[PDB]
Design an enzyme around this catalytic site. Structure first.
Site, PDB file in Angstrom:
ATOM      1  N   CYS A   1       0.807  -1.219   0.000  1.00 47.18           N
ATOM      2  CA  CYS A   1       0.000   0.000   0.000  1.00 47.18           C
ATOM      3  C   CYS A   1       0.847   1.280   0.000  1.00 47.18           C
ATOM      4  O   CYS A   1       1.492   1.561  -1.005  1.00 47.18           O
ATOM      5  CB  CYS A   1      -1.138  -0.097   1.010  1.00 47.18           C
ATOM      6  SG  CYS A   1      -2.287   1.280   0.777  1.00 47.18           S
TER       7      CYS A   1
ATOM      8  N   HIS B   1      -3.190  -5.112  -0.037  1.00 49.10           N
ATOM      9  CA  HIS B   1      -2.548  -5.771   1.082  1.00 49.10           C
ATOM     10  C   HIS B   1      -2.470  -7.284   0.835  1.00 49.10           C
ATOM     11  O   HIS B   1      -3.474  -7.975   0.999  1.00 49.10           O
ATOM     12  CB  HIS B   1      -3.367  -5.419   2.322  1.00 49.10           C
ATOM     13  CG  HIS B   1      -3.082  -4.040   2.832  1.00 49.10           C
ATOM     14  ND1 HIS B   1      -2.060  -3.723   3.681  1.00 49.10           N
ATOM     15  CD2 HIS B   1      -3.726  -2.880   2.514  1.00 49.10           C
ATOM     16  CE1 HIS B   1      -2.097  -2.403   3.896  1.00 49.10           C
ATOM     17  NE2 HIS B   1      -3.104  -1.837   3.207  1.00 49.10           N
TER      18      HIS B   1
ATOM     19  N   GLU C   1      -1.094  -9.482   2.645  1.00 50.55           N
ATOM     20  CA  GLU C   1      -1.098 -10.156   3.935  1.00 50.55           C
ATOM     21  C   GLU C   1      -2.400 -10.908   4.185  1.00 50.55           C
ATOM     22  O   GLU C   1      -2.401 -12.016   4.711  1.00 50.55           O
ATOM     23  CB  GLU C   1      -0.977  -9.166   5.093  1.00 50.55           C
ATOM     24  CG  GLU C   1       0.084  -8.074   5.061  1.00 50.55           C
ATOM     25  CD  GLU C   1      -0.445  -6.787   4.424  1.00 50.55           C
ATOM     26  OE1 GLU C   1      -0.588  -5.750   5.101  1.00 50.55           O
ATOM     27  OE2 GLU C   1      -0.710  -6.842   3.210  1.00 50.55           O
TER      28      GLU C   1
END
Ligand SMILES: Nc1ncnc2c1ncn2[C@@H]1O[C@H](COP(=O)(O)OP(=O)(O)OP(=O)(O)O)[C@@H](O)[C@H]1O
Ligand SMILES: Nc1ncnc2c1ncn2[C@@H]1O[C@H](COP(=O)(O)OP(=O)(O)OP(=O)(O)O)[C@@H](O)[C@H]1O
Ligand SMILES: O=c1ccn([C@H]2O[C@@H](COP(=O)(O)OP(=O)(O)OP(=O)(O)O)[C@@H](O)[C@H]2O)c(=O)[nH]1
Ligand SMILES: O=c1ccn([C@H]2O[C@@H](COP(=O)(O)OP(=O)(O)OP(=O)(O)O)[C@@H](O)[C@H]2O)c(=O)[nH]1
Ligand SMILES: O=c1ccn([C@H]2O[C@@H](COP(=O)(O)OP(=O)(O)OP(=O)(O)O)[C@@H](O)[C@H]2O)c(=O)[nH]1
Ligand SMILES: O=c1ccn([C@H]2O[C@@H](COP(=O)(O)OP(=O)(O)OP(=O)(O)O)[C@@H](O)[C@H]2O)c(=O)[nH]1
Ligand SMILES: [Mg+2]
Ligand SMILES: [Mg+2]
Ligand SMILES: [Mg+2]
Ligand SMILES: [Mg+2]
Lengths: 559, 372, 372, 559
Positions: free
Chosen positions: D404, D525, D527
């Site tokens: 990001c 993102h 993750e």
């Protein structure tokens, strides 16, 4: 390490096992750490293969060893734990040296009974006596060896030869021999030639007795002592007697009255053994506790009657740990015990046609009893008679304990009569017909010390209160068959609660029935964990329940 | 690493539920409180920021008064209890402020004394360090009076016994390491038969190696039993407490249902030589707290007093021994009373001021001081 | 960090000056030689690169044969001495290669055994560790046979003595720490009057605490003096070596001008029970190396043999004691001979194999093995 | 449908989230379909408005819901997809019943917290637990409810009241309670009064715990278990402990070692749930995979160091999905991970005047690292420090991932230093001055799962090879600012290739730099799509690149 051989005599029934156990406990009153070894001339590796109709029951150790009955006498008098190594046999030691000769540890030498087998026996005794057997970490100070069979039976020869060598391969004043021998009485005169011949048979093998322990139906005359002490090397105080008293707990104090410790305290130099201030206290405290329980047997009169229902009850040696477990539980209650020996088959209605006398006597005995025990022992004889005793005890509200087969019999009874499954039965004997109402199933054995976990709701039960409301119990198992775990929820819903199970579940170990003063069963044998001052909890429950005062017993246990 | 406050918020509610309203909240924590940790409690409770006290996990419990004083805790109670309205005399304010300066000095001495004296304390259940708290505090007062740091070595007395060398050889060697290491030895009291031969072995070691020894209550009887077993050579002489089921003739203890509280000890007439009577200022009598049912057999006392183990002090009636000192050792002493209980921060227990001086050296200079 | 070569270049010239010409140069260094360090020597001297040997400062002297074998040193001497021209039988090559595999195994066991047995060695001048080299090697052979690592704790015997606690209190506490720490004790021999009461104190400690003890030469006489002073209770009984200017009647040693070299010990007839006679395979006689002028007073021997300190073995003539074992201890033994000198790498000295097994436990299994 | 409430304790930091996630995955080893619900007593509708300085990061769902962090623990342990409905809050449910009362569905009744709000909570839990959450079509068998905050905090009151009712509004044996509680240790003694008080606070609300789960710095003593199991209704096996181990992946096997499944298998009657032969296989297979990854953490030693550069790194909860994404990527490589926490501001040259200690330590940490991550998070603090880390990583050829804000920082860095536009900058903070060299621009959020299309030439890139050379990628977005698409062709000509974009173009989503071993960034993102057996592809790239073996990883992915 000190050794005390207890040995021989003229007959195989002479009662060495009591004298060995009693001699060891008397040495324990000095605070010495004690252990013991039973030698059996038989060729069986263990007592597990051999049927209870010979040498009484097999005894189960924490190891799962199905040992000779005499190991139980040692565990319950001495307070020790024995290993499967503490029962030596002809079968064990010939299997050991033959497997060792095929492996070749003897370096291509010719292997012979002397020296190789007699040195293997001496190595066994040296290894095994140094196993720690109390709960403490220490190696034993004294070992009692009991030489099974009789001296000069050819069966015994390697052990009498090994023990001659052992008297030198360990020091003198570290080894002593007690010979136990028969002094029969004829026309009221105490005849001595059988024991003179047995003392010669010891000398012929080079074993020299340090005490002669007479077994007789009388006090020895002072002439009977002198005529033995003049023939043998023993002094007058080294001719021991043990009388035909019923209370085997009196034997330690009858040996102490004959000053037998005061001889071994010299002859084994037990004052040279170092002892701490805790040891002498816990030693003398143990003697006072034994004076009290024997005083209680002298002055308790108010009989509790327990009926023991089983196969072959004429062989009273077949149930010796049950008998001793009931006696410990009755002493803890300060009450005298009668056992009523009910041959379970005679209860069965076919007996009322075949021999109407045996029918009425067996049902008299069962109706008479303040509590009932079904003791275990595999084999199909009399099981409907044992089912009839479980029925009678459930319906008449009479205290019941079922041990091993006795639990399965109570499960079969409750299924046949309270669940109303009229043909539900043991898998042990009907499975040639492939029956669907299986009460037992097979689950090749489950043996030795195992954990039972109490199931979560069980806090109400008299049996879990007798185990101090602890979450787990350690007891000795011996079974191939167990309750069908598909049917367990039916019994647990109808009120026959399986209060305890194995860690895995699906294997039931304790039950108690809702709505009876004390109706209990165990898959394990609670007998084998009994000790003189600390009776087996299920049996302390039964013998309190029969007497009344089961609440006060549980209130005591909560301290 | 974040200082969580919900346990103390719940405890402050549990006080309000009973109608008890706290005037100060005293946090116990492994850290200094953050200023956020103070504010998050002082905003939840009625207490102001200066009424959220903390006491840190410091080892020196003598520092706590000055850690509360640094947090200005008196200046709150001086208002909240109106302690300026209490009348005080000119002696009272002096003896009050003098006491504060003495406490600043003993705490300064713990900050800047480094030269360790090691005392081995030999007894039952030493893992329960709360079991010996007056001994610990009596030794700390005696080490501060000497201007020396203390280590206590906690020796579980049973592990000294030769059976331990078979049962758990690790515990044997560690316990005998600890006992051999020590500049002085204490046997602290406490009834019960566990480990007493181990305590006899410590008394033996201390007598033979000439290492300073103090035996308190059971520790005196253990030293009497040791001296009987090994210097008089009576190999089975023993406590009446546990062998008397066998009716033994060599009684070292006997029963004399308790003797309890403050009692007078009279020093026996010849005792002027003893380090212990010099530590009590050569006064003829001593007042100390007793607690025992068993005492030295007074039939055997003359044998010990002839062999050099002098019962320096006794009860007013005699036949009841209360202090011993051994001729021919730098400091080997015992007491039937507990000297711990009469210890005070500025005035340590005299038998312990003897032990901790003797371990350090300078026992003569301590006695020379006490003669002022 | 640079491996300097001029000392060895000068030593190679000093050989040439006498006409001796080196066939290999064997460097002693705290490192592996650099390949430049090899070349700078092999270019100066007549030796080839494979004839510059190194031996590193490793602790295990048993690894040196395999460090020379890794450097291919046999493959040079096999040419340079023409060892293929020496005739050898088929038994010789087998018993030769078998010996190499046994040495690979004992060195593998030193690489992968970790479970330490601690032996305290108590004597004069222990800073001179070369003074006890056969003891050290005898203990290492006995620890390898047990598959256990050894620590020796070097206790200067004088520092155990209570006078040390006044003279240098540091040396006192360290020496008694070391002795208390040990799984077994050795008193190694060596004439001279320094520290003998300290060696008596180690023998006392080992008897009383039930800790394995071996006394070699003077160490046996010290254990006899200790047992006389403390178990027979003869408080002034002593060595004839140093007090006889005062003509003392309680003689523990006497003179019997040396007894030296390999001699026969006969085991006395009752001795079959002893751990030491079982370690000698229950054979009736033993051959070991003597060196002494003083021996146990044979007038006092029956007192010790009645009190339990059995003189298990004697000279052919009697009146000259050579092995003792004490009844009522796991392993308390002494020898008049030096058992060290008959130790071999694969066949350790039997009294030392007893001591180092006894310290570890498994003394029964060692004796069971020896019965094969 | 079965429910398992995980609840309460004495403190808010106690670690319920690990225990809930671990308990659910253990139930998934039986093959059961599983789901979970997080309850938050806070008044925020979502975690989106609230700053990362409290309760860690917001977690993004496929819906675009900015939920509480604890939903991520469930998605990554259980493998499930959660909806914005699975995070219940005080704000959500009071907004729901108040909007419903103004609409008037309550038929002019007075609306009250009981029964109307507690019935609205129970309706929410009943609706939401039946949402299918695996990729398969099935409704879940089991739901884990995690009750946030602490019991008896006034914030929690409607949820503890609702859950009392729920224990009956759904059957018993379809609901069970785990209580998680603090067992502090003082002077080495394990003190129990905090958990006894928390067990009373549950009983005061009528909630009865079926297991007590201790959180402690030690193994519980058997006395610590008994002193709790005697005070509470729980049996000894129902007092769970979870130790302060670093590896949160070991917790499932520490609960399995404590036999916790074998209790819930009875207490929820999970043998009555029907399961297919595929279900039991895919269930047991999942357990073996977890035994392997935990074995690999026990025996992998060869550290890869990743430097994580960002704001407020002392709040390690602020980056929990980054941490877990890096740990999944390091396990897939069979390598141990160190994260080096670099506070991005301390890298900035002003720090060398203000606190020279913090300057040198932060530049030590950044220079030390085998690879670099710039993790995201809005706010103007430290961004030149993050630009300096991107510069260092580009110039020293050290593996870089920018997530990001980390992508925009790398674009600003490459513009400032390789294009040489010295004042080019984020529109986020300088636009009060209306600057022409805009690197970011605004494009009120872009949120949730979106498609990225790989631009046509991109076949060469390590990042497109890590995504299996598939033409499209699905990942979770969260941003208001993006790369200025007027400047994109300058970067794509100078070698900073925008490898992927939104379907419409003019919105850049992945870059990879030509001429570096691994220098990559993402606008999404990555993750949040990480799973324990299937790590996030950009992170599997970074942690392989740092280690070496990025070619072998890509060769593997081509199977
Ligand atoms: N002195 C005794 N007093 C009372 N009963 C005895 C006595 N001696 C033997 N008995 C009894 O005789 C039976 C056998 O005794 P015991 O077991 O001790 O003999 P044993 O020599 O060990 O026989 P076995 O070799 O079969 O084991 C037991 O019932 C025992 O109680
Ligand atoms: N048993 C545990 N083992 C290791 N770490 C734990 C454990 N329990 C809690 N933690 C850690 O403590 C922190 C909070 O744990 P967790 O999120 O599970 O608690 P929580 O009760 O859900 O807190 P919150 O209500 O804020 O969400 C996390 O860093 C977590 O990893
Ligand atoms: O019938 C006869 C004839 C002769 N004898 C003869 O044998 C002798 C040995 O005497 P016993 O054989 O009677 O033996 P004993 O009394 O010593 O032993 P116990 O068995 O009673 O203990 C003498 O008594 C002698 O008369 C008998 O014993 N019985
Ligand atoms: O897991 C969750 C979910 C929700 N909540 C919610 O409960 C609230 C109360 O906040 P806390 O319960 O964290 O309490 P606190 O920080 O005031 O107290 P300490 O115990 O730390 O001293 C808010 O923080 C809200 O998000 C949690 O606390 N934890
Ligand atoms: O300080 C000085 C000056 C001069 N030299 C001079 O002596 C020469 C011989 O060189 P070295 O004396 O250093 O000897 P070396 O290196 O061969 O041997 P090692 O002892 O290191 O094995 C040359 O190096 C020359 O410069 C020194 O060695 N040292
Ligand atoms: O200081 C005091 C005085 C009195 N009491 C008294 O309170 C009693 C209750 O005992 P505790 O309060 O110590 O509680 P506990 O040990 O059961 O619980 P944990 O918190 O350790 O888990 C008894 O121990 C009694 O002496 C104290 O606890 N502390
Ligand atoms: Mg027979
Ligand atoms: Mg028998
Ligand atoms: Mg908080
Ligand atoms: Mg959480």
């Amino acid at each position: 390490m000190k050794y005390v051989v207890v040995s021989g005599g003229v007959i195989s029934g002479i009662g060495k096992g009591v004298l060995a156990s009693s001699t060891g406990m008397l040495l324990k009153t000095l605070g010495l750490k004690v252990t013991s070894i039973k030698i059996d001339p038989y060729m069986n590796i263990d007592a597990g293969t051999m049927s209870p109709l010979e040498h009484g029951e097999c005894f189960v150790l924490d190891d799962g060893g199905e040992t000779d009955l005499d190991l139980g006498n040692y565990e319950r008098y001495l307070g020790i734990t024995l290993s499967r190594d503490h029962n030596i046999t002809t079968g064990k030691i010939y299997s050991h040296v033959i497997s060792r000769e095929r492996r070749g540890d003897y370096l291509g030498k010719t292997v012979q009974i002397v020296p190789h087998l007699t040195n293997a026996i001496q190595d066994w005794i040296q290894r095994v006596s140094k196993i720690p057997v109390d709960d403490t970490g220490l190696e034993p100070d004294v070992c009692i060896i009991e030489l099974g069979g009789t001296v000069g039976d050819i069966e015994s020869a390697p052990f009498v030869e090994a023990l001659r060598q052992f008297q030198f391969e360990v020091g003198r004043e570290n080894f002593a021999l007690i010979h136990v021998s028969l002094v029969p009485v004829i026309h009221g005169e105490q005849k001595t030639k059988p024991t003179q011949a047995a003392i010669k048979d010891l000398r012929s093998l080079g074993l020299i007795p340090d005490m002669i322990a007479c077994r007789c139906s009388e006090e020895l005359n002072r002439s009977t002592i002198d005529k033995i002490a003049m023939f043998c090397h023993v002094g007058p105080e080294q001719v021991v007697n043990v009388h035909d008293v019923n209370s085997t707990y009196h034997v330690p104090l009858l040996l102490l009255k004959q000053h037998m410790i005061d001889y071994l305290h010299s002859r084994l130099k037990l004052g040279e053994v170092p002892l701490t201030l805790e040891d002498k206290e816990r030693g003398s405290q143990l003697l006072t506790n034994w004076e009290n329980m024997t005083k209680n047997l002298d002055d308790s009169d108010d009989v509790v009657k327990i009926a023991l229902v089983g196969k072959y009850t004429n062989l009273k040696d077949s149930y010796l740990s049950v008998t001793k477990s009931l006696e410990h539980a009755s002493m803890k209650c300060r009450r005298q015990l009668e056992i009523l020996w009910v041959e379970a088959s005679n209860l069965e209605p076919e007996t009322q046609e075949v021999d109407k006398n045996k029918f009425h006597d067996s049902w008299n005995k069962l109706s008479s009893a303040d509590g009932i025990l079904v003791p275990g022992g595999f084999g199909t004889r009399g099981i409907e008679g044992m089912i009839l005793a479980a029925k009678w005890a459930r319906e008449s509200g009479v205290p019941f304990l079922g041990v091993c087969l006795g639990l399965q019999v109570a499960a079969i009874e409750f299924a046949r009569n309270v669940i109303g499954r009229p043909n539900s039965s043991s898998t042990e004997f009907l499975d040639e017909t492939l029956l669907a109402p299986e009460d037992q199933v097979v689950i090749t054995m489950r043996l030795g010390l195992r954990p039972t976990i109490f199931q979560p709701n069980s806090e109400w039960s008299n049996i879990r209160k007798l185990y101090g409301e602890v979450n787990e119990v350690h007891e000795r198992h011996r079974h191939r068959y167990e309750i069908n775990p598909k049917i367990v929820n039916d019994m647990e819903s109808r009120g026959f609660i399986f209060v305890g199970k194995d860690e895995t579940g699906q294997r039931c170990e304790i039950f108690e029935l809702k709505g009876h003063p004390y109706y209990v069963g165990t898959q394990y044998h609670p007998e084998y964990t009994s000790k003189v001052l600390e009776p087996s909890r299920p049996f302390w429950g039964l013998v309190a329940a029969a007497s009344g005062t089961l609440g006060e017993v549980i209130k005591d246990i909560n301290l």
